[model samples]
Target chain A: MDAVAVYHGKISRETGEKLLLATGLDGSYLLRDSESVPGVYCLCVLYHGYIYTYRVSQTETGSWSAETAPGVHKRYFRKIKNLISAFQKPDQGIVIPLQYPVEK
Target chain B: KSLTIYAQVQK
Candidate 1:
């Protein structure tokens, strides 16, 4: 396993909270939005300028589910490979610069 | 002859 930043979007309050709890073993849910939307999910690993959209799914009766999209892994792998290659060659970075500034 | 310079760094 690698240390990567996980970005989850379109997740219901309950599911997002559960994920946060699981990560730190806090067992407490952290709800972002007051309102909840059912049956939409997005799990991704963001690194450098690339985002690996691993699992996109929906909540079905308390369980999270997803469908396999063809070429997802291939795309992610290619992006990661490109990242590595660019890292090796700083002058030839293949990533697009972020439009917005990151706030600490 | 050399003169000693003392500078204090404060944060």
Candidate 2:
């Protein structure tokens, strides 16, 4: 997932939020490696001028999962990109649907 | 269900 287009190596959580807000559109999103947690990636989306972040982590088994909600059953994916498209759909746990990606 | 902080929560 390092090669994922949405993933930006230079952005921090604050920068990601700033960029999303600057875009001024709902459902615009970007990806960055988590500063607090090693080996975790953040999926940040702009919804109503606020940034909502979803934590994505990879397993040693080489699977991927997103932190959607507590009661929602964890979904495992073969790739980070695949995990994202699933969240892109409506009625998922995220605040807004992922429509635009700030790609690399 | 909330206004912000969609994904990060104590586990």
Candidate 3:
């Protein structure tokens, strides 16, 4: 059966948390190393009419940085590549998704 | 539950 994941809430910008848009994968990935096992640990949420693709990664050190405006999948893929091409690598440290029946 | 409303305006 396909993995069943929960929809954790959003992150407060005040926390200074951010996420790197994972182009190769479907969603974003935490830029920093996490204590949790390495795998897809977060889900990307694009709210209706919102400009940025919100992602809450499981980390506590840094934040996400992008060269272009943050938005949905189309926008993320474009902007993330732009940042990488400019030799800019950002880290996201903030709230992470908490789901049961963890999938490996 | 969230609400959805429809409106029509005549000029």
Candidate 4:
């Protein structure tokens, strides 16, 4: 359903990391298929030469959110891209806010 | 404030 360039559906973490690393930006990030979990995605954002990853998926109502925060309730976004947009304003649960997308 | 309770927020 998501046709965004950031959504590298089949790319593995190794490639995701490399893609984000190639950007060389503190908040450069990408979305990739989770290797372990089906129907879930790995959100990888680079910070200080390290990739901070999280799990994101859709809810029963069709809204999408990231499984980054366990203690607090998750934030909902209608479009998958807005999840990235949300982090652009502030950190939320991320170590750093999302800056650039390692688009396809 | 950090949303994750697991994160130790330096006060």
Number of the top TM-score candidate: 2
Ranking by TM-score: 2, 4, 1, 3
Across all candidates, the chain A TM-score values are: 0.25, 0.91, 0.17, 0.90
TM-score of each: 0.24, 0.86, 0.15, 0.83
Which has the higher TM-score value, candidate number 2 or candidate number 3? Answer: 2
Task: Please provide, for model 2 over A71-93, each residue's C-alpha lDDT reduced to its tens digit, 9 standing for 90 to 100.
Answer: 65778899987877887888776
Q: Assess candidate 1 and give its TM-score to the true structure.
A: 0.24
Instruction: Write out the backbone clash pairs for model 2.
Output: none
How would you encode candidate 3's per-residue C-alpha lDDT over A1-104 as one tens digit per residue? 12122222233321112222112222222222222334212233211211122322322333333222234222222333232232222223212221111112
lDDT, ranked from best to worst: 2, 4, 1, 3
Candidate 4: segments with Cα more than 4 A from true spot: B1-11
Of 2 and 4, which scores higher on lDDT? 2
Kindly provide the TM-score of model 4 when superposed on the true structure, using C-alpha atoms: 0.83
What is residue A76's positional error in candidate 1, in angstroms? 21
Q: Model 1, A7: alpha-carbon shift in Å? A: 7.3
Clash pairs of candidate 4? none
Per-residue error at A34 for model 4, in Å?
Answer: 0.7
Question: Which structure is stronger by DockQ: 2 or 3?
Answer: 2
The number of the candidate with the highest lDDT is: 2
Judging by lDDT, tell me the better candidate of 1 and 2.
Answer: 2
Model 1 pairs in collision? none
Task: Kindly provide the TM-score obtained by chain B of candidate 4 when compared with the true chain B.
Answer: 0.39
